[PDB]
Homo-oligomer: 339 residues x 2
């Protein structure tokens, strides 16, 4: 149950823009929402194309596609804006979960107290609108609450992304993560070297994160790759994912240590498509989620990991795509940007 | 010369261009050859990137991608040029199979005679260089051989593509097809309604194509869509597959006949990506191989545009959906070509 799509506000925005034809991208959970929204906008004399790709982030706006098919503007359902060049005017429609964060915290006060007095609090987009309540509740429980602004890849203070934990690079004794899954909490534990407690607002369940099992698991992939001679080094052309210079660097670095390395260019980074190439191992220089989150035949490493493989790095490190300083914050609802 | 990758010629055309960084596209069977060529070119001071996607035709050059990552040119392995605008100079490197086709013809000369005196001869790209021998042989046995030039999506006279049988639209009693597999000769028969005899040059086996089983399958699929009210109308942004105006027509048509219709824009067209959408049936206006050659992956009724018109009761007889080009002024070489726009 999400906060409902603001069809009205959206339409008012197109009207202003003087947009006649639009493309709508949507994530897996919002497909039916996407069409419903389309019918409505066509009822009001606007032509709507739907994007057929399942979208996974604002790091991947379908603006170039919009341009190609002659669209005036892009609607991006389900995510907030991260700083990118956009080729047509784009309306972002953050989706906010309705579930009560504070109820989930109230059931777990005792666990949260094991974190310390001054704590760092983090969450995901789906809960960012209740972070102020969550902070006020925690302060009313005796905690000092530390929340980081984050960099240009982040939309709001306290928000973490799979590739980015800059909001957690602040002073504090322990880290509270509000949301589901163990990937972010794990990412936080490794990136900060702090104790991490994760609370799932849906289930009210909690997890104390231990990164050592993960780090050991990664080290076995690094070990397998120790004897590899031939590497493929992968980039993604997604607007917010391309990391050419870094991939070039990794290529040069593997060669200098007597390996062969070839840069490979993809869109969706997908092991399957690579099975015929002659390479013995892979380095993904895109979004950390791909390799870290373990079913590929050959080893696949992040750029940090390959630095360890070549013994130019000693401690394990999570791969993050960092942004630049962020001027202001995004709104808790619709926003529109253009270039 | 002709049957392996001409590293030196490729290197020579890159030099002439002044290309210092190239992107190499390859299909499934040439993944290893792609990297061997990359290694060779890098030994010669050209920076090489590989395209990680799996390519399925010259209708989908990775020239925009080449541009985005700073490449001077694109190498396109395994296919020959079809008329498209290109953002970087592109070297095409078509694949030519080695098998001599005549032996298989000699074996089956009897069956070929049942096509009549004047016959239409067709093949696929990988035997195109053998077409001259085949013609000379058939004539020496008394046939009259007609070979169509085909339109701008075809690279050589006599060559068929899965979505284009234009080389077959010429005067002739019956059609001979030299090659393997069932999709092409079946496409020929459906698209020309003429007698088609298929001969595989490897096995020397022959087959007379009966499209009855295929067309009946297509009526069934149309039957299933007769109930649908919500329609997804699909285009692909691959350079040589983008049929926007025709997709818009089909949307307008569907609505005009009471159905709901939405235009959906993809790159690679496949059902799984569409599973969460509300539509009860789909129209693919792109590469007809998708709906016409589905092994079973589409769990909702998926149609070609031709088949939509039949459903709304605007057609009476089945027609194969082809992607057609315009007049082609010249022919591609039997070897590498290089093309540009910008």
């Amino acid at each position: 149950m999400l906060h409902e799509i603001p069809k009205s506000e959206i339409l008012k925005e197109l009207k202003r823009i003087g947009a006649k034809r639009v493309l709508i991208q949507s994530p897996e959970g919002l497909r039916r929402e996407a069409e419903e929204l389309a019918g409505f906008l066509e009822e009001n004399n606007i032509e709507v194309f739907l994007h057929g790709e399942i979208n996974y982030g604002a790091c991947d706006p379908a603006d170039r596609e919009a341009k190609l098919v002659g669209c005036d503007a892009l609607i991006h359902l389900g995510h907030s804006y991260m700083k990118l060049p956009l080729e047509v005017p784009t309306i972002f429609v953050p989706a906010f979960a309705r579930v009560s964060v504070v109820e989930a915290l109230k059931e777990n006060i005792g666990e949260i107290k094991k974190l310390g007095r001054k704590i760092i609090v983090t969450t995901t987009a789906q809960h960012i609108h209740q972070l102020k309540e969550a902070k006020e509740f925690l302060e009313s429980e005796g905690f000092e609450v530390s929340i980081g602004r984050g960099d240009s890849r982040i939309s709001w203070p306290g928000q973490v992304l799979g590739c980015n934990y800059s909001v957690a690079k602040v002073r504090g004794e322990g880290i509270l993560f509000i949301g589901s899954g163990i990937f972010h909490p794990l990412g936080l534990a490794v990136a900060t070297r702090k104790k991490v407690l994760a609370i799932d607002p849906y289930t009210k369940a909690f997890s104390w994160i231990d990164p050592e099992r993960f780090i050991r698991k990664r080290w076995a992939q690094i070990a397998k790759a120790m004897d590899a001679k031939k590497f493929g080094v992968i980039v993604s052309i997604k607007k917010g994912q391309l990391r050419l210079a870094e991939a070039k660097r990794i290529v040069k670095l593997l060669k200098k240590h007597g390996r062969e390395a070839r840069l490979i260019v993809m869109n969706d980074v997908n092991y399957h498509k690579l099975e015929g190439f002659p390479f013995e191992a892979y380095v993904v220089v895109a979004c950390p989620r791909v390799p870290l989150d373990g079913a590929w035949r050959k080893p696949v490493l992040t750029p940090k990991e390959v630095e360890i493989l070549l013994g130019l790095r000693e401690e394990y490190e999570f791969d993050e795509i960092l942004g630049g300083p962020r001027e202001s914050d995004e709104p808790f609802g619709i926003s529109i940007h253009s270039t």
